[PDB]
Point group: C5
Chain length 209, copies 5
């Protein structure tokens, strides 16, 4: 029976923040899911939007695993003590402003969960934001330097409440949110990079009828 | 015969800033209490507020205790040399801007006290801010990754003037501040995260 | 008997930045004085001002003294190598923006001087700024975690012209500056905290 | 064999981030190509633009190479663990804002690849941005401290769509982009610094 | 023969970043010359100007010199591995924004050169900026903690095109620039601090 102090200790040794946990030669399965929390600055003229969302990220790193039959099977670890996916938002025009503590959750089986609350600005289609159908902003997130053979991002598509955690005090209301998996290759190079395309459909609230 | 130099050296030798000081399977009891110092910006249309407040935070970490019968029973320590609760404002739309030196106070009995002055923007109910009844902005502060079995958060509900340290130079005034213990559970997982619900009742000054 | 490289070497070998240089058991005498350089942005509606000033900070650290009979009696040192008072502006609404190199001047007798140029925004009485009597903005600076028995702050009773280094290109002009010593206590805790209350009376330049 | 960890451990072990990987006294062949992703702020009065581009930079560091006959031939590495060309946008008026993970790609032959997405503001000709001819903003990128003998910069001449990865939601559109190799020289010294002069022909998307 | 790696290492193992490289008692002779590259945010009401310039800074450290008969006679070295003059713009109202790689240049003879391109806001005379005579903004740069005995600054007095590198796309133009040597003392202290007073005479471009 070991305590949390040891669990972190053994992790800080078997872990490599800059080494992708590629088991055998299969890519790392990275699950990416966003939970829109608020929509703030929207400019239909420039087509830019400021969003706040919880980026639920999940992946596995066996090396971290440990016996929890008589010990804690989950601990909070600083992301800098672990390896994390170099995920990026392709159409982002500002760097992610992480608002919460940068701690990840690690389970004795190696499963890793990281869910930061992020404030970021995007360049997307904002036209129709002040119309009934609303506007649909597409966010593309995926690894930046790890192609499909190294990292495979897949959205945890599961019928959930889109505006479930959305601020009721927002000026906008969520009409719908669909998250589709996609892949991007580049004419120069053979490898392709997987990504998740999150489509955010929203409109202004209190519009005349 | 110990001194401040030694008290610190010891904390360095025993403190595990990245490991929650959990005794047995008993969650670390964290006490949180906000003290509104100022309200800088308020948007009646976007329901957003920019405020300044002291966030009094307390918890125990016996592994840092020491005999103070022959030396100071308290010293200032950089929070980076100590474990700190990963508290967060669930409804904050900006990262916390700490305006004060990031030092905590550690008492010979292991008691830890951290009270930084913070400026932060939040998303809450601003309606009625211009009336006599004022608005009620509710702020939720609780652990971000540690649940009830690991961390517990209870407000320091006592008697004092809600606006006892509030700038008299603000455009607003505090009518009342109430802080209650709350809980947050997410649809996916049974685990629950304790938090403190801070309700700020304020209105614009000079209710014409 | 030595060079500047030796002096600095010893300082790093004996100095402990996270330990206040308490001599015996008496509080560390920290002297604080502000020499206003500019008044940039002002808002009489929100009662906020942006200010640039030199925060002349002084105190003593005996654990750094050295024989200078045949060696330099003074050297510039990175504040990150020395212990520095955890001063703060109580009514500041933005963290201090240090504009100058963060080097302190250490004397062979243990005297330490740190005078950074700082730009910071404060919440204070800006009313009457466009009048003849002008406005009086009071700035309060004192230790954040060290109470009176650990740190005492007092203004340098040295005389000098207030708008001496004040930019003549500022839209405003300094009418007077009084730096009073003060103490604060909190209904929760016995210990009190010292601070220097700097009242800056200024106004928008008129004409004729 | 040699898993990714062995390679990364080796690179970390042999990498000299502060030394230029000069084969003989041949300068280092650095290639840079900009992929304009968006044009955000544009001011024809001040001749200032805010652009987002992927600055594809490539060079070689033979000392990093390793045998990949039965091991990974490419890995992602933090640029902090590698030497990087000290490129600068001569006509930039803001420090480069890297929006992506600062990781490069290292190939078993020593080929280093780094392609950050950068948002930056430049001072260039903006006049005509509203006409059909559009405006022609020219950006000059090159080493800042290393001249032609130490570092050479050549554009990856490869006919591809200029606005291939240009946001369709931008108020502007790309007319044509030319990345010509150029050079610079300062009146003082003979040393000439190689650069890449990128001419961006863009205009505001009219009503369509 | 020595490669760049051996040169750097010798430098690193003998440079003292926090120790002023004094020779005997004499002061370290630092040369400061500014090359205005652009003028941006200008305000005659607030008397503030935004300016971009190259701050060519030169000094020597003979302890770093080496034999370059058959080895590189110059190398680029990170300013963090070397001691750098703690220069500061006395009338700057914003911290300096360094737009370029923070790399210095060390010559085999001990000469050290550092020329960062800096963007920074200043408080100076802006009156008449829209007149024919234009305006004259005076920038004062010089050591912050080192007095005349430890550091001395000499303006690079040499006939050269003032707007040689000045942006043509700027909304303003340089009428003339003068870099004189100045000295400063404070009623408290006998020592003086040398500096270089740069007087930029510019105006708003027009058509005639
Ligand atoms: O399951 N959840 O939705 N959890 C959740 N939403 C907001 C905060 N939170 C708890 C949590 C759980 C795990 C990690 Cl790594 N961070 C945060
Ligand atoms: O109890 N208090 O309200 N204390 C208090 N308010 C402003 C400054 N201050 C002193 C203090 C006490 C303890 C810590 Cl960790 N930080 C600061
Ligand atoms: O005595 N002074 O007023 N000194 C002073 N005013 C502006 C700059 N300066 C020099 C100085 C002296 C000592 C230190 Cl630690 N920093 C700066
Ligand atoms: O060739 N590309 O255009 N590649 C590319 N564009 C966006 C992301 N990406 C992949 C990539 C691969 C390697 C490096 Cl060092 N940077 C980026
Ligand atoms: O004017 N110059 O001699 N050189 C120069 N101007 C802008 C860039 N540059 C090259 C250079 C030369 C030396 C150093 Cl330390 N940095 C940069």
């Amino acid at each position: 029976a070991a305590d949390r102090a040891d669990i972190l200790y053994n992790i800080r040794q078997t872990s490599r923040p800059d080494v992708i946990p590629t088991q055998r030669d299969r890519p790392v399965a990275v699950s990416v899911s966003l939970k829109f929390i608020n929509i703030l600055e929207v400019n239909e003229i420039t087509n830019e939007v400021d969003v706040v969302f919880w980026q639920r990220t999940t992946w596995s790193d066996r090396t971290l695993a440990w016996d929890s039959s008589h010990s804690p099977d989950q601990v909070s670890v600083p992301i800098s003590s672990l390896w994390v996916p170099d995920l990026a938002a392709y159409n982002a025009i500002s760097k992610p402003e992480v608002l919460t503590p940068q701690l990840a959750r690690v389970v004795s089986d190696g499963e890793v969960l990281y869910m930061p609350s992020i404030r970021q600005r995007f360049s997307c289609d904002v036209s129709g934001v002040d119309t009934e159908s609303g506007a649909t902003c597409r966010i593309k997130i995926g690894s930046w330097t790890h192609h499909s053979r190294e990292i495979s991002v897949d959205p945890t598509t599961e019928n959930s409440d889109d505006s479930e955690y959305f601020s009721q005090y927002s000026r906008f209301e969520i009409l719908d949110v669909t998250q589709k998996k996609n892949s991007v290759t580049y004419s120069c190079c053979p490898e392709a990079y997987e990504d998740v395309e999150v489509s955010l459909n929203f409109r202004k609230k209190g519009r005349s009828e």
